[PDB]
Amino acid sequence: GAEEITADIPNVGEAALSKLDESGIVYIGAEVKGGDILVGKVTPKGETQLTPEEKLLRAIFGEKASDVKDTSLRVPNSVAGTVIDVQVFTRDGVEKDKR
Amino acid sequence: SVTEFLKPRLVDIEQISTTHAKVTLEPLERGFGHTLGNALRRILLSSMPGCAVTEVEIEGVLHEYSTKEGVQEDILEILLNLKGLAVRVAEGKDEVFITLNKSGSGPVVAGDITHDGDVEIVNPEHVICHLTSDNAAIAMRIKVERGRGYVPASARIHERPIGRLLVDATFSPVDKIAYSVEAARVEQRTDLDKLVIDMETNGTLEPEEAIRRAATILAEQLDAFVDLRDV
Amino acid sequence: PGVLKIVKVYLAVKRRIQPGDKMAGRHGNKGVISKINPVEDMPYDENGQP
Incomplete structure (x- = not known):
């Protein structure tokens, strides 16, 4: 399918989404450190085989949300700075997000 | 006698300028002038408390690497200029907020900062920024904190709203210290010396007070040796 | 071809001097802090200037 730039990043809490806007792009002027999410992107993934131990673990606790995988842009390690400019390039024929 | 020494006293204080002074300690025995002078110079240059700007908030500014209309200087230059602000905060308060609003063309200086009467600006002529238009306006909220030593912005332990700008703070008010040991004419003895300490500061700290804090620190550290035991 | 969107973010880092940085003059005299x-x-002089 088509990869989407959205803030709905699986297995990530609202602590890491504070600097992100509704469209999933970091604000301008945000103090970001290593490992912080700048742009939130989710990639579609196919069916993945689960080991029998993992199947039992899912049987006990029913949590399972793995429709998409987290492939998002993150600040490189040992790099700390401020976001001073963000530029979005969209292909002709693709809907423009709010940002 | 030989066992008993003579204790120095603070005999003269001279204020050549607001940021320059000389303090005289007299009398001193042989060799004690250099010892006390070096100890006091090292303590004064390292461990003197002060007040410094830590956080700035400018309306319409999101980050330091930006520009504001009608201002010749960038926000980085304004913060660097704010780093040189000499502020004295009344005792009992370790945190204060001051406010600077100015409109119209001209040099925005430290004398235009509105305080609460518990904050004294020692250098009212310090140029903070320049407004190059009659329509230009500046509105800033400055945070002044009491501290000791040098605390960079990164060293501060980590919500902080976007628009609050961290400033590296050098709290120590002492800039330069020199000391000279000269001859002193006391009674009939010649071995007695006199210690003159030249202090160049930002004007926040009084010379006598700084001398007493340095002596207190030295005595408190010496108390461990005065009562040497295995701990 | 095949690309839908691109997002570019610019990060400003203030790098301060520290041991390991290379400092040099104009006469070929290089060194590491x-x-x-x-x-x-x-060291300081008679006027107290270090």
């Missing part, structure tokens, strides 16, 4: 000495330890 070994220690950030305190001001009191540094």
Whole structure:
């Protein structure tokens, strides 16, 4: 399918989404450190085989949300700075997000 | 006698300028002038408390690497200029907020900062920024904190709203210290010396007070040796 | 071809001097900083300027 730039990043809490806007792009002027999410992107993934131990673990606790995988842009390690400019390039024929 | 020494006293204080002074300690025995002078110079240059700007908030500014209309200087230059602000905060308060609003063309200086009467600006002529238009306006909220030593912005332990700008703070008010040991004419003895300490500061700290804090620190550290035991 | 969107983010980093940085003059005299000495330890003249 088509990869989407959205803030709905699986297995990530609202602590890491504070600097992100509704469209999933970091604000301008945000103090970001290593490992912080700048742009939130989710990639579609196919069916993945689960080991029998993992199947039992899912049987006990029913949590399972793995429709998409987290492939998002993150600040490189040992790099700390401020976001001073963000530029979005969209292909002709693709809907423009709010940002 | 030989066992008993003579204790120095603070005999003269001279204020050549607001940021320059000389303090005289007299009398001193042989060799004690250099010892006390070096100890006091090292303590004064390292461990003197002060007040410094830590956080700035400018309306319409999101980050330091930006520009504001009608201002010749960038926000980085304004913060660097704010780093040189000499502020004295009344005792009992370790945190204060001051406010600077100015409109119209001209040099925005430290004398235009509105305080609460518990904050004294020692250098009212310090140029903070320049407004190059009659329509230009500046509105800033400055945070002044009491501290000791040098605390960079990164060293501060980590919500902080976007628009609050961290400033590296050098709290120590002492800039330069020199000391000279000269001859002193006391009674009939010649071995007695006199210690003159030249202090160049930002004007926040009084010379006598700084001398007493340095002596207190030295005595408190010496108390461990005065009562040497295995701990 | 095949690309839908691109997002570019610019990060500004203030890098301060530290041991390991290479400092040099204009006469071929290069070196690596070994220690950030305190001001009191540094040599000073008769006027107290270190």
